[PDB]
């Protein structure tokens, strides 16, 4: 007859009913996702709304147990993850307005159009063609027109909606004792009551700003190299001591630089490893790839596939009429059912994406013993890191020369080493400054440090200060550039892409020390080494049961995220770069501009 012994009694029934209803809803969602028809849409929406209403009723019922007297930590975690009102704490009118403006923002982002100044009946959407002109073209004026029009004709519609979404989210977060909407987002890395692993929401900003301070000595050199190379594709447009114009980076916003590799390849006379002709000329089918991936995963000591995975998963594209949107995902329908959905071909990128997906599948198979509310990653960034280190280790020449895709000798030279490391750097270390800057800007906006009459000015100031790119055309306070991004207009968090990049290399260097590696870090494999599988499974089976700063210690040996593994991974490229800029000027000045003339 206590206020704790009722919590477990309620939690058992909730777990049972929730598992049942969630399996129903997820099965309906899969039935739609793999077979796009008309009745399947309503068959999925029905179960979806039923599960949502059930969760809402359980949430408004679980507010009878005060979190102040609960003593056990697992039941406390479950109740706290179930108790949060979230939205709907506002009045009804405000909630309707917020939902309407969110839907309007998503619709405006999805279906925007911009057409030529000399032929107004040939406009293209973003996805099929705009980020293709921005990715494949080599003409200055065309890229400039695209980058300017996509922000002038679609961005100008999002400002009077963002200026209200900010206020609505601020109120929704202040009604839950969070002081702003940014603290609500950082509330995922929050840890209380462990006596040795505490982590307050406010320390995340300090950790990010103190770990980003060690990457600049590498990003500056990479930037100087990219600039000294770009000054040969568009001469008389880049000055040797200025920033890079924000439209010559490779895509619409400059999030990834990977589309620049055709211009800045160090040794353009050595083709990097691409085992796609061997796979095709050795008659490899869509099932052999998954068999090889399962063999690799069972080599390290993780369990086999559940045998319910081979009969129901959709590995091949259904031909005649079964039109199905196949973006590769791994499903966790529950009750011991794991499925994979991807229209695979026989190439190398899908051969790596198979390992990436089986990473998520193994993760979801590991912690399937915890209660329902604790079936997730340790935080919002562990899942993709676990899924990524596998594909990172599954593309090394030592591994590919033992499966059979490569010749058994395949003489190696340091030139292909540099090629691969540089192609990796233009995607890994090329997005961290942009991510950190965008997150800092959104935090400073939500908190209230930037009055609404100084948004674009501070945004471009921070872009000139941190990332190192400058706008090609002045932008006044009528535009809205941040809202023209997908993650900003649909209300998605962005800080996870900065912690995943560090967790990935921390895990990699931690496991590569268990397999007793000898050479540099980027030539290691964790296959055929059983201790690595044990060290990884010691963290895989936890879920959200323990604070993430504990599951991070079980594999690495530290308490917080670090940045030394990344520089240890990129050391060779770092040296070769430091020996390449004897005549250039490493760094940038924030005064030059492509219109100040």
């Amino acid at each position: 007859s206590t206020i704790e012994e009722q919590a477990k009694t309620f939690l058992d029934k909730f777990n049972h009913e929730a598992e049942d209803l969630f399996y129903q809803s997820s099965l309906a969602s899969w039935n739609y996702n793999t077979n796009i028809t008309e009745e399947n849409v309503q068959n999925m929406n029905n179960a979806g709304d039923k599960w949502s209403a059930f969760l809402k009723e359980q949430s408004t019922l679980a507010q009878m147990y005060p979190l102040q007297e609960i003593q056990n930590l697992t039941v406390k975690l479950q109740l706290q993850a179930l108790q949060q009102n979230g939205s709907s704490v506002l009045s009804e009118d405000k909630s309707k307005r917020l939902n309407t403006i969110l839907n309007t923002m998503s619709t405006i982002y999805s279906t925007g159009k911009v057409c030529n100044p000399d032929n107004p009946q040939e406009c293209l959407l973003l996805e099929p063609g705009l980020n293709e002109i921005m990715a494949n073209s080599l003409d200055y004026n065309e890229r400039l027109w695209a980058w300017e029009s996509w922000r002038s004709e679609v961005g100008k519609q999002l400002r009077p909606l963002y200026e209200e979404y900010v206020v609505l989210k601020n109120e929704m977060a202040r009604a839950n004792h969070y002081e702003d909407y940014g603290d609500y987002w950082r509330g995922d890395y929050e840890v209380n009551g462990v006596d040795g692993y505490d982590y307050s929401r406010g320390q995340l900003i300090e950790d990010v700003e103190h770990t980003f301070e060690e990457i600049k000595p590498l990003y500056e050199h990479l930037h100087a190299y990219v600039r000294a190379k770009l000054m040969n594709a568009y001469p008389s447009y880049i000055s040797p001591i200025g920033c890079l114009p924000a439209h010559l980076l490779g895509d619409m916003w400059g999030r990834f630089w990977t589309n620049l590799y055709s211009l800045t390849v160090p040794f353009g006379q050595k083709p990097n490893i691409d085992v796609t002709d061997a796979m095709v000329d050795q008659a490899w089918d869509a099932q052999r790839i998954f068999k090889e991936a399962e063999k690799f995963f069972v080599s390290v000591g993780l369990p086999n596939m559940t045998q319910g995975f081979w009969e129901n998963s959709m590995l091949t594209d259904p031909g005649n009429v079964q039109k199905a949107v196949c973006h590769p995902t791994a499903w966790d329908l529950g009750k011991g059912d794991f499925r994979i959905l991807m229209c695979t071909k026989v190439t190398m990128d899908d051969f790596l994406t198979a390992h990436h997906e089986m990473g998520h599948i193994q993760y979801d198979m590991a912690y399937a013993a915890q209660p329902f509310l604790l079936r997730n990653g340790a935080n919002e960034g562990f899942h993709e890191a676990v899924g990524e280190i596998m594909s990172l280790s599954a593309a090394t020449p030592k591994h590919l020369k033992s499966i059979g895709l490569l010749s058994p000798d395949f003489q190696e030279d340091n030139e292909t080493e540099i090629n691969f490391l540089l192609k990796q750097a233009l995607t890994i270390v090329g997005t961290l400054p942009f991510t950190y800057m965008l997150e800092k800007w959104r935090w400073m906006v939500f908190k209230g440090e930037i009055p609404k009459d100084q948004w674009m000015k501070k945004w471009w100031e921070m872009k000139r200060e941190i990332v190192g790119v400058v706008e090609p055309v002045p932008h006044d306070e009528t535009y809205c550039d941040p809202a023209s991004l997908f993650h900003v207009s649909n209300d998605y968090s962005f800080i996870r892409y900065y912690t995943r990049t560090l967790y990935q290399f921390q895990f990699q260097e931690a496991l590569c020390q268990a397999a007793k590696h000898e050479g540099p870090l980027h030539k290691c494999d964790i296959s055929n080494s059983t201790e690595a599988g044990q060290k990884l499974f010691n963290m895989l089976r936890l879920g959200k049961s323990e604070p993430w700063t504990l599951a991070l210690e079980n594999v690495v040996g530290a308490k917080n995220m670090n940045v030394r593994p990344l520089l240890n991974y990129f050391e060779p490229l770092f040296t070769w770069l430091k020996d390449q800029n004897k005549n250039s000027f490493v760094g940038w000045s924030t005064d030059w501009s492509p219109y100040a003339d």
């Binding site: 009722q6 399996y23 009750k335 794991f338």
Partner: protein, 97 residues
């Protein structure tokens, strides 16, 4: 069956643990708190009977298994149920045993 088989129940709420070899068929509302509920579902008063959601697309570990438990016992009876042996053929014109 597809779409669920809700005809196999299992009781998960009992005030006291079961003594060896006892069977209970009660369906009274298990009362967890301190307030009488007089036999209606709601808060802190739950119904103790729940049903498996058996479906064919399950993984080994949630599919329905059938169990048959045998028990053996000898209280005092001299000649009872016993297994069959081999009817030793009967020979003739030959003494032995």
């Amino acid at each position: 069956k597809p779409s669920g088989n809700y005809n196999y129940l299992y009781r998960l709420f009992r005030k006291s643990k079961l003594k060896p070899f006892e069977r209970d068929i009660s369906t009274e509302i298990y009362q967890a708190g301190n307030k009488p509920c007089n036999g209606v579902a709601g808060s802190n008063c739950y119904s103790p009977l729940q049903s498996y959601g058996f479906r064919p697309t399950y993984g080994v570990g949630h599919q329905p298994y059938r169990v048959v438990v045998l028990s053996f016992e000898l209280l005092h009876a001299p000649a009872t149920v016993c297994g069959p042996k081999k009817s030793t053929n009967l020979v003739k014109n030959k003494c032995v045993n």
